Task: structure prediction
Amino acid sequence: CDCSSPENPCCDAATCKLRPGAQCGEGLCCEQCKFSRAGKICEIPRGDMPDDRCTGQSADCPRY
Result:
């Protein structure tokens, strides 16, 4: 499923998959059914490492 609730307007409830025009249904890098812009910070480490940032081509916050 792209969406795990039937109430999510990004998917069709009947299919649980994205509607035409939607790039995503949930995830830290999904913004109103579109991919969040590339470089948007999505995870800030406790240690002295660079932030994870949205790639602009995935709904999830990458690990790297």
